[PDB]
Every structure is written in C-alpha cells, then in structure tokens.
Design a protein around this motif. Structure first.
Motif, PDB file in Angstrom:
ATOM      1  N   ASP A  62      -4.162   4.482  -3.680  1.00 45.37           N
ATOM      2  CA  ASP A  62      -2.693   4.200  -3.861  1.00 45.37           C
ATOM      3  C   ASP A  62      -2.033   5.264  -4.736  1.00 45.37           C
ATOM      4  O   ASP A  62      -2.421   5.424  -5.879  1.00 45.37           O
ATOM      5  CB  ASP A  62      -2.465   2.812  -4.478  1.00 45.37           C
ATOM      6  CG  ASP A  62      -1.121   2.218  -4.097  1.00 45.37           C
ATOM      7  OD1 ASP A  62      -0.074   2.693  -4.579  1.00 45.37           O
ATOM      8  OD2 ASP A  62      -0.989   1.273  -3.293  1.00 45.37           O
ATOM      9  N   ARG A 112       0.692   5.284  -6.336  1.00 46.14           N
ATOM     10  CA  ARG A 112       1.604   4.911  -7.378  1.00 46.14           C
ATOM     11  C   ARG A 112       1.063   5.254  -8.763  1.00 46.14           C
ATOM     12  O   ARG A 112       1.852   5.514  -9.680  1.00 46.14           O
ATOM     13  CB  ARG A 112       2.050   3.470  -7.254  1.00 46.14           C
ATOM     14  CG  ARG A 112       3.262   3.357  -6.356  1.00 46.14           C
ATOM     15  CD  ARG A 112       3.610   1.934  -5.920  1.00 46.14           C
ATOM     16  NE  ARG A 112       2.516   1.345  -5.157  1.00 46.14           N
ATOM     17  CZ  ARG A 112       2.477   0.096  -4.728  1.00 46.14           C
ATOM     18  NH1 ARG A 112       3.472  -0.747  -4.948  1.00 46.14           N
ATOM     19  NH2 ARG A 112       1.420  -0.306  -4.061  1.00 46.14           N
ATOM     20  N   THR A 125       0.859  -1.143   0.000  1.00 50.66           N
ATOM     21  CA  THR A 125       0.000   0.000   0.000  1.00 50.66           C
ATOM     22  C   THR A 125       0.918   1.222   0.000  1.00 50.66           C
ATOM     23  O   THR A 125       1.703   1.405   0.951  1.00 50.66           O
ATOM     24  CB  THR A 125      -0.818  -0.004   1.295  1.00 50.66           C
ATOM     25  OG1 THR A 125      -1.679  -1.173   1.384  1.00 50.66           O
ATOM     26  CG2 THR A 125      -1.756   1.187   1.312  1.00 50.66           C
ATOM     27  N   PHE A 156       8.194   8.691   4.670  1.00 56.53           N
ATOM     28  CA  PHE A 156       9.312   9.497   4.177  1.00 56.53           C
ATOM     29  C   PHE A 156       8.822  10.683   3.335  1.00 56.53           C
ATOM     30  O   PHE A 156       7.684  10.664   2.857  1.00 56.53           O
ATOM     31  CB  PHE A 156      10.284   8.634   3.392  1.00 56.53           C
ATOM     32  CG  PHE A 156       9.713   8.019   2.120  1.00 56.53           C
ATOM     33  CD1 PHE A 156       9.742   8.710   0.923  1.00 56.53           C
ATOM     34  CD2 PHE A 156       9.211   6.726   2.123  1.00 56.53           C
ATOM     35  CE1 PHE A 156       9.230   8.149  -0.230  1.00 56.53           C
ATOM     36  CE2 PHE A 156       8.702   6.144   0.972  1.00 56.53           C
ATOM     37  CZ  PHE A 156       8.699   6.851  -0.209  1.00 56.53           C
ATOM     38  N   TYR A 214       7.298  -4.661   6.511  1.00 60.80           N
ATOM     39  CA  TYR A 214       8.087  -3.437   6.534  1.00 60.80           C
ATOM     40  C   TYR A 214       7.176  -2.277   6.234  1.00 60.80           C
ATOM     41  O   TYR A 214       6.357  -2.352   5.306  1.00 60.80           O
ATOM     42  CB  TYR A 214       9.185  -3.436   5.474  1.00 60.80           C
ATOM     43  CG  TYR A 214      10.049  -2.186   5.593  1.00 60.80           C
ATOM     44  CD1 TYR A 214      10.814  -1.949   6.752  1.00 60.80           C
ATOM     45  CD2 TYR A 214      10.087  -1.228   4.578  1.00 60.80           C
ATOM     46  CE1 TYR A 214      11.623  -0.805   6.875  1.00 60.80           C
ATOM     47  CE2 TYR A 214      10.915  -0.096   4.659  1.00 60.80           C
ATOM     48  CZ  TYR A 214      11.668   0.125   5.817  1.00 60.80           C
ATOM     49  OH  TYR A 214      12.457   1.247   5.966  1.00 60.80           O
ATOM     50  N   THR A 215       7.312  -1.210   7.012  1.00 62.08           N
ATOM     51  CA  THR A 215       6.465  -0.040   6.886  1.00 62.08           C
ATOM     52  C   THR A 215       7.319   1.208   7.141  1.00 62.08           C
ATOM     53  O   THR A 215       7.973   1.317   8.183  1.00 62.08           O
ATOM     54  CB  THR A 215       5.259  -0.112   7.854  1.00 62.08           C
ATOM     55  OG1 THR A 215       4.481   1.075   7.696  1.00 62.08           O
ATOM     56  CG2 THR A 215       5.731  -0.243   9.294  1.00 62.08           C
ATOM     57  N   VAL A 216       7.285   2.135   6.181  1.00 61.09           N
ATOM     58  CA  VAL A 216       8.043   3.371   6.311  1.00 61.09           C
ATOM     59  C   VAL A 216       7.232   4.612   5.881  1.00 61.09           C
ATOM     60  O   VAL A 216       6.301   4.529   5.075  1.00 61.09           O
ATOM     61  CB  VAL A 216       9.316   3.352   5.479  1.00 61.09           C
ATOM     62  CG1 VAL A 216      10.469   2.838   6.315  1.00 61.09           C
ATOM     63  CG2 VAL A 216       9.144   2.506   4.221  1.00 61.09           C
ATOM     64  N   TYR A 275       4.950   3.589   2.794  1.00 59.01           N
ATOM     65  CA  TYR A 275       4.858   2.341   2.089  1.00 59.01           C
ATOM     66  C   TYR A 275       4.781   1.254   3.143  1.00 59.01           C
ATOM     67  O   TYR A 275       5.454   1.337   4.183  1.00 59.01           O
ATOM     68  CB  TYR A 275       6.068   2.095   1.200  1.00 59.01           C
ATOM     69  CG  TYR A 275       5.918   0.860   0.335  1.00 59.01           C
ATOM     70  CD1 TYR A 275       4.717   0.614  -0.356  1.00 59.01           C
ATOM     71  CD2 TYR A 275       6.963  -0.070   0.194  1.00 59.01           C
ATOM     72  CE1 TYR A 275       4.566  -0.524  -1.180  1.00 59.01           C
ATOM     73  CE2 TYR A 275       6.827  -1.225  -0.636  1.00 59.01           C
ATOM     74  CZ  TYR A 275       5.622  -1.447  -1.299  1.00 59.01           C
ATOM     75  OH  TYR A 275       5.429  -2.548  -2.092  1.00 59.01           O
ATOM     76  N   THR A 276       3.968   0.244   2.867  1.00 52.15           N
ATOM     77  CA  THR A 276       3.763  -0.844   3.765  1.00 52.15           C
ATOM     78  C   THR A 276       3.697  -2.086   2.899  1.00 52.15           C
ATOM     79  O   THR A 276       2.988  -2.099   1.916  1.00 52.15           O
ATOM     80  CB  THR A 276       2.433  -0.622   4.509  1.00 52.15           C
ATOM     81  OG1 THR A 276       2.509   0.586   5.282  1.00 52.15           O
ATOM     82  CG2 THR A 276       2.195  -1.700   5.524  1.00 52.15           C
ATOM     83  N   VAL A 277       4.445  -3.117   3.267  1.00 56.66           N
ATOM     84  CA  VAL A 277       4.425  -4.389   2.574  1.00 56.66           C
ATOM     85  C   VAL A 277       4.591  -5.541   3.524  1.00 56.66           C
ATOM     86  O   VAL A 277       5.301  -5.435   4.524  1.00 56.66           O
ATOM     87  CB  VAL A 277       5.666  -4.652   1.625  1.00 56.66           C
ATOM     88  CG1 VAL A 277       5.275  -4.522   0.197  1.00 56.66           C
ATOM     89  CG2 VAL A 277       6.934  -3.912   2.034  1.00 56.66           C
ATOM     90  N   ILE A 321      12.753   4.477   0.062  1.00 57.03           N
ATOM     91  CA  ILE A 321      12.456   3.232   0.762  1.00 57.03           C
ATOM     92  C   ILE A 321      13.752   2.416   0.986  1.00 57.03           C
ATOM     93  O   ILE A 321      14.005   1.916   2.064  1.00 57.03           O
ATOM     94  CB  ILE A 321      11.466   2.446  -0.074  1.00 57.03           C
ATOM     95  CG1 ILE A 321      10.036   2.909   0.240  1.00 57.03           C
ATOM     96  CG2 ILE A 321      11.662   0.954   0.151  1.00 57.03           C
ATOM     97  CD1 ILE A 321       9.071   2.807  -0.891  1.00 57.03           C
TER      98      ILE A 321
END
Lengths: 57, 57
Positions: free
Chosen positions: B1, B3, A28, B43, B39-41, A39-41, B18
């Motif tokens: 989203d 993107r 997402t 930025f 994993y979640t970031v 960003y999350t994965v 990322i």
C-alpha cells in the motif's frame, strides 16, 4: 455505473465515504509499475439509500 | 500500500484526484448484489512526486 442514478445527497455521501476510507486506510492504494496510482474501495450507503438504488437499478 | 510512503501533501493530491475523478465520472462506481458500493480509479501524480515514490520502492 451507479453514479448516473445517484441523488445529489447520495453523491456527497459517497464522496465522504471514499474520503474517510482513504484517510483511515481502508481499501487498497497501489503504485503501479509505470508510476500510476489506483485506489479501490468498498463501502455502504445507509440502508434506505441502497434500497432506492436497488429499485431503480 | 503506497499510503505509508506518501508525504502528507502527496496524500492530499491523491485525495483531490480521487474526488475529481469521482465527480467527473472517471473510474468505475458499482452497486453489488448485496447493496454495497464499490469504486475503483487510476490517476497520475505530477512526475516529480511519482519519481520520488518509485525511488522509495
């Protein structure tokens, strides 16, 4: 945070999974009210890497 | 989203970001009960890019 348990080879494996996921459109990616991007994965490492982590963890 | 709205350059800057955040220990990388990695970031992009993205939203 598993990162500080990662093998160097394990660390590369993640980066690529995150890349590929980001490129194929999994996870997402959200643009927040204040303009910040997140960003999350979720993904998998190969089984034998996971078990090694499940062990030291 | 977001993107769908990125330019290919903005798409790129996101990836570099990322990848840096992951290498430098930003965001949160976890291992689940089931062995999955997550994993979640969060930025920033440069102001002008951000501004463009907010406009088309």
């Amino acid at each position: 945070d598993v990162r500080h348990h990662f093998t160097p080879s394990e660390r590369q494996l993640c980066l690529s999974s995150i890349q590929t996921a980001f490129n194929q459109g999994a996870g997402t990616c959200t643009l927040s009210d204040s303009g910040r991007i997140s960003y999350t994965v979720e993904f998998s490492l190969p089984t034998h890497h996971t078990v090694r982590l499940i062990r030291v963890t």
